Amino acid sequence: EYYSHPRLFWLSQTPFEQRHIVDGFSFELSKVVRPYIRERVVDQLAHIDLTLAQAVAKNLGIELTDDQLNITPPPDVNGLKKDP
Amino acid sequence: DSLAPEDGSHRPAAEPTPPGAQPTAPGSLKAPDTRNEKLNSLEDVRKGSENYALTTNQGVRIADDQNSLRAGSRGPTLLEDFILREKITHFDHERIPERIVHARGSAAHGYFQPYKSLSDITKADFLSDPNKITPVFVRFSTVQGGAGSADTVRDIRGFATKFYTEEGIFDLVGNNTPIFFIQDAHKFPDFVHAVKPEPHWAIPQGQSAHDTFWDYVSLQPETLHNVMWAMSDRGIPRSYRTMEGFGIHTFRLINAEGKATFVRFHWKPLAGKASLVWDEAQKLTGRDPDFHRRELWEAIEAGDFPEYELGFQLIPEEDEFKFDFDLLDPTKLIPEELVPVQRVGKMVLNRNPDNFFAENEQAAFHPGHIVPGLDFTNDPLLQGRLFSYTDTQISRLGGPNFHEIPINRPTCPYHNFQRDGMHRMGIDTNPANYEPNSINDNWPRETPPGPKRGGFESYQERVEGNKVRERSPSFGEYYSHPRLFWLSQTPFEQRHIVDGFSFELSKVVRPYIRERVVDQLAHIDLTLAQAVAKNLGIELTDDQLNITPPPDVNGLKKDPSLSLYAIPDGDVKGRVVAILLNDEVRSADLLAILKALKAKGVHAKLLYSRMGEVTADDGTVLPIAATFAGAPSLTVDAVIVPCGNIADIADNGDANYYLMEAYKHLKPIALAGDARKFKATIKIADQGEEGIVEADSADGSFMDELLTLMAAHRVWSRIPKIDKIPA
Amino acid sequence: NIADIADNGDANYYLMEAYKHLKPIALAGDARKFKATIKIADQGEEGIVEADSADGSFMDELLTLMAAHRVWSRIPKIDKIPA
Amino acid sequence: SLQDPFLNALRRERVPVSIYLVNGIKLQGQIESFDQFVILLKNTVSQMVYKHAISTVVPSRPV
Amino acid sequence: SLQDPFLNALRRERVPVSIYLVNGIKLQGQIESFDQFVILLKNTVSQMVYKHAISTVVPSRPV
Amino acid sequence: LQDPFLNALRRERVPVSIYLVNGIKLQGQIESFDQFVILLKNTVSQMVYKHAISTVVPSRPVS
Amino acid sequence: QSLQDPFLNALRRERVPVSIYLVNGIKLQGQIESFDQFVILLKNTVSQMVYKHAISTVVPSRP
Numbered sequence A: 001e002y003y004s005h006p007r008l009f010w011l012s013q014t015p016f017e018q019r020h021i022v023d024g025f026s027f028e029l030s031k032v033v034r035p036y037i038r039e040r041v042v043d044q045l046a047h048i049d050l051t052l053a054q055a056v057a058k059n060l061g062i063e064l065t066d067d068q069l070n071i072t073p074p075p076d077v078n079g080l081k082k083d084p
Numbered sequence B: 001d002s003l004a005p006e007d008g009s010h011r012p013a014a015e016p017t018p019p020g021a022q023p024t025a026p027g028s029l030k031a032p033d034t035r036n037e038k039l040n041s042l043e044d045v046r047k048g049s050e051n052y053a054l055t056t057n058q059g060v061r062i063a064d065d066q067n068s069l070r071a072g073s074r075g076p077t078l079l080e081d082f083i084l085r086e087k088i089t090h091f092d093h094e095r096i097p098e099r100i101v102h103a104r105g106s107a108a109h110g111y112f113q114p115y116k117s118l119s120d121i122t123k124a125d126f127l128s129d130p131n132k133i134t135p136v137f138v139r140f141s142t143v144q145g146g147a148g149s150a151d152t153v154r155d156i157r158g159f160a161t162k163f164y165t166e167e168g169i170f171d172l173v174g175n176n177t178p179i180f181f182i183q184d185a186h187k188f189p190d191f192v193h194a195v196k197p198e199p200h201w202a203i204p205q206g207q208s209a210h211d212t213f214w215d216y217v218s219l220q221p222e223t224l225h226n227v228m229w230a231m232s233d234r235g236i237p238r239s240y241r242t243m244e245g246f247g248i249h250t251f252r253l254i255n256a257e258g259k260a261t262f263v264r265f266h267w268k269p270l271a272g273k274a275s276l277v278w279d280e281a282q283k284l285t286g287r288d289p290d291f292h293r294r295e296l297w298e299a300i301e302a303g304d305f306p307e308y309e310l311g312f313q314l315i316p317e318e319d320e321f322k323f324d325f326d327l328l329d330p331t332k333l334i335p336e337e338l339v340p341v342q343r344v345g346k347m348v349l350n351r352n353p354d355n356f357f358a359e360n361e362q363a364a365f366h367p368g369h370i371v372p373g374l375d376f377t378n379d380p381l382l383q384g385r386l387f388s389y390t391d392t393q394i395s396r397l398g399g400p401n402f403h404e405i406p407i408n409r410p411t412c413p414y415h416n417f418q419r420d421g422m423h424r425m426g427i428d429t430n431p432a433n434y435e436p437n438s439i440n441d442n443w444p445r446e447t448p449p450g451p452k453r454g455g456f457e458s459y460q461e462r463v464e465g466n467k468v469r470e471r472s473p474s475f476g477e478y479y480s481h482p483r484l485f486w487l488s489q490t491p492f493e494q495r496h497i498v499d500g501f502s503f504e505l506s507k508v509v510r511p512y513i514r515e516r517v518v519d520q521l522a523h524i525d526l527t528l529a530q531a532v533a534k535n536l537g538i539e540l541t542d543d544q545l546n547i548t549p550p551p552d553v554n555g556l557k558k559d560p561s562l563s564l565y566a567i568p569d570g571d572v573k574g575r576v577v578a579i580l581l582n583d584e585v586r587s588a589d590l591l592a593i594l595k596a597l598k599a600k601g602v603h604a605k606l607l608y609s610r611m612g613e614v615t616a617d618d619g620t621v622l623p624i625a626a627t628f629a630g631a632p633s634l635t636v637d638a639v640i641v642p643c644g645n646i647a648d649i650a651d652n653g654d655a656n657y658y659l660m661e662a663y664k665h666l667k668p669i670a671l672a673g674d675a676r677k678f679k680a681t682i683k684i685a686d687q688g689e690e691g692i693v694e695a696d697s698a699d700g701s702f703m704d705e706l707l708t709l710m711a712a713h714r715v716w717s718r719i720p721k722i723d724k725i726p727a
Numbered sequence C: 001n002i003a004d005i006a007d008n009g010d011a012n013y014y015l016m017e018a019y020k021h022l023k024p025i026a027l028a029g030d031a032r033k034f035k036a037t038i039k040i041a042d043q044g045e046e047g048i049v050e051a052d053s054a055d056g057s058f059m060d061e062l063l064t065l066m067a068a069h070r071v072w073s074r075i076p077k078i079d080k081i082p083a
Numbered sequence D, E: 001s002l003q004d005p006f007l008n009a010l011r012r013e014r015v016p017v018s019i020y021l022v023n024g025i026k027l028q029g030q031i032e033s034f035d036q037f038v039i040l041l042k043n044t045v046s047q048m049v050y051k052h053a054i055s056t057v058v059p060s061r062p063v
Numbered sequence F: 001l002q003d004p005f006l007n008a009l010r011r012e013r014v015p016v017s018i019y020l021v022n023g024i025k026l027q028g029q030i031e032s033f034d035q036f037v038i039l040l041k042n043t044v045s046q047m048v049y050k051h052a053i054s055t056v057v058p059s060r061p062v063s
Numbered sequence G: 001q002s003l004q005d006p007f008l009n010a011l012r013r014e015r016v017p018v019s020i021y022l023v024n025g026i027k028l029q030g031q032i033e034s035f036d037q038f039v040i041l042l043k044n045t046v047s048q049m050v051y052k053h054a055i056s057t058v059v060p061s062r063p
Ligand code: HEM
Pocket: B099, B100, B101, B102, B105, B139, B140, B141, B157, B158, B159, B160, B173, B174, B175, B180, B185, B188, B247, B248, B249, B330, B363, B364, B365, B381, B382, B384, B385, B388, B389, B390, B392, B393, B396
């Protein structure tokens, strides 16, 4: 299982903390030269949270597809919606 | 279903291509056609990878490389997992000692050839025939910082060339200044400890701006000449391609009759001289600390081979004493006004290595690797160096057999009676391991010295004196060379020197050291000491103000060869320009921009607020290489902002600051059409200003004004205007 | 003597960088004229402590901003500043 | 004379060339002008090259 | 012919030049005057350069 | 003598070794000549000056 | 407009020490004893004769 922990992490973060995460990925990803890698990392992000993948994909100039937009988020972790 | 992209965009073109165009790649895959005898001799130890099975080092194919062998899908790891143990073990022992100094360094392959036979003055086989091509390996470097320190630090640069000649390896191990810090190798470690991080806490990294270094300087004025160079823009080059290189010591050339001629070696950059400015250099260590290593790598992939011209200062034996400093003192330069540099040949650096550890990290340069035709002098710093570069290999590269490491392997024959190191590769078949030996008819044999292909024999210099530990009195002059240096520099160059000292000195915590360094500066030039002392808040005393300047050097009041920018020889081929995009670039602007630049070999990188693409006004699709923040003005030589939807970027913090930083660092800026509204941020007048190219659109005229600013490297005239801008 | 530093590139940028990185800034008396560079309003702004002089109140507002570490509320306003 | 028909070609064709000097240096650019004694070689600037110091002219493509 | 206007402008404009000789030495300075056969290059002293020995004359910037 | 000898190499289209003053050895076939220059062919056609040539050596004998 | 004759005459007349760099890079020192169209007599400790076609540059040891 790969996604529910990232998700937990992400939803525990304050809004400004999440901008930072977004900008973190966008910055790093932008120095990956081979763009197919950028896409594949975005694809992973789609499985964690769609807000997140949208923001990053915007910043890299990527359109999430219909497929990607519909990806079911992973389960809560033991019924948790956040951990402060 | 394999993991490479379907369209093949994982794999770079085997073609000269610009910085950013392609992923970078090992020389043998990016430039397979480039060859030379060294690079082909390496073939036996290269390893490919495609269409091969993953295996243990012992040859066993691996089936699962994703798991330890455990008792159960959730049990302990077992000691019988030899695949895991080998894989981890090798990883565990990956690292070898970094260099004591010049640990941080960047290399490439290439070749050299002489312009004409030099047999008049030396029997050095590699200089015997202009048709003789000699493969080289060159490593440029900093001095102080560790192997993982920054590239653009204010330090000396090293410049080491290994010549793989037909009569042995010749190592030319030089720096980017023509003198050294110290006079006798016995104080080598003292100085190096003084500039290296402080021992209690390991601070600062690749910087001289600390207490101990200046403490030392202040107590050993022998250092001042080279410290001058360091503080100048010389100590923060633009590119390894854009600095001069020096052998420093006087050596000897020896010809077929045994005539000795003194010589000092030079590398002269066909790219010309160019250096950054401090704020730019310092902040660039943060924005891209691999800046030099990168620029070198890319320049080479891009076809912009770094070229340097090997030149000699030659001084006849009977001139030893004509100069009013000592030729053997390594803290003195030979002014080119008194001895000019004669270009002798040329070196081209035309291919990157395949593996950085294999080839760079393990290479061993040593100045005492000379050949017949060359010899040493009594320079007491050189004398020292001879000892150290052999010794240190024993622990850096693990033993006496370091010459067997592929990159270090000679390309001519090598045979002797030396047996048995650690990690011995060669398997000697000689029935004998000693000479004289009758059992193998004394092979291999001594070779009497001769015109070419002879034994090495030292020049039979007369030695007369007692066994003493004493500095030559003739070395006792410290100031006239600094003075010479300083008066050769342009006014803006001197501001930089001043600000150099002021900055460094300001991070010396113990103020009495600041005073003592100022006192030294007083003995070199009073202008200089005043400016620095002002900036540190020090009043020179009456005593200090009256200090007599040192003599001219052999009647010289300046030497233009010591300035970077006296006579600009700045060259645009290989340089890079930032193009600031908006979502609606006026295509015929851009067409003309890239077309002009391309004609003079100048690279562009198209930048935006985000990655991906934007579209031109005519619907040409413009791929973005990095964002404004991703590739700061630091990394480029100029900034161009074409017309279009200026509204898109007009209020963008990052695009504005791109320009403000660029302006503060004296870079050319070119604004077309509505882009001229950016003049507002750079607090420029509406009248215009020199260094800001502006027009309704980018045309013949617009581009030429810009490229011409670039041939001047920087806009020095801007200096007075930049203190008001807050960047 | 604010006049001393008022037009100094480095002192201004010190403030601009500090502001872009969401740090607390405190300006007494004529130092308030630096608000101009940070493109701050005359009304005030949260995260910029300001007053005729440094007193009990001035210092406490500042130290309290510090207990919050950074001025997160500033984020929306920083993209216009060019630092 | 064969010098000039050839030099003229290279000039009007703005072909890039490699001038090899007797001293063994290599020069590069585009031929801007020439007479009985010099060649002007265009790059960033123009440079005057003495034909007495030139050993060989090589074009970057046949003309 | 060409030498003359080229040299003349360098001088008149006081623009720094480099002069690469056949012996592999590179002289620098400002062109003071010339001749059928020589050039005077100003630095600390003026010095006399025999044209037969010059291979290229290289301006530091456009004229 | 220069023209009997050159024409013979040109007409027979024989490989020649041209050594220069610096010591460099060039190779190929002589396509045409002039009072001042020679055109040597192999990969590209290049223009050598006679003042820079030291010796022309035929790869094989002519009349 | 000859310059090389006034220049060389001035040097000898004032008996001022000079450096003469030859075409192979070699430095000669002395005072000019007298000269020709074709040679210079350089008085050092011995009077020696230097061919002008072999001289690159002539350098006064003062203005
Ligand atoms: C003359 C001034 C000097 C110059 C131009 C100079 C040049 C250098 C350069 C460029 C390197 C980096 C070599 C590389 O890329 O592998 C270096 C490394 C080294 N130098 Fe210095 N150096 C100087 C003074 C000294 C002195 C005085 C000593 C000791 C007395 C010393 C001992 C070393 C050692 C032991 C290494 C590196 C370890 C190794 O490569 O085996 N050098 N030298």
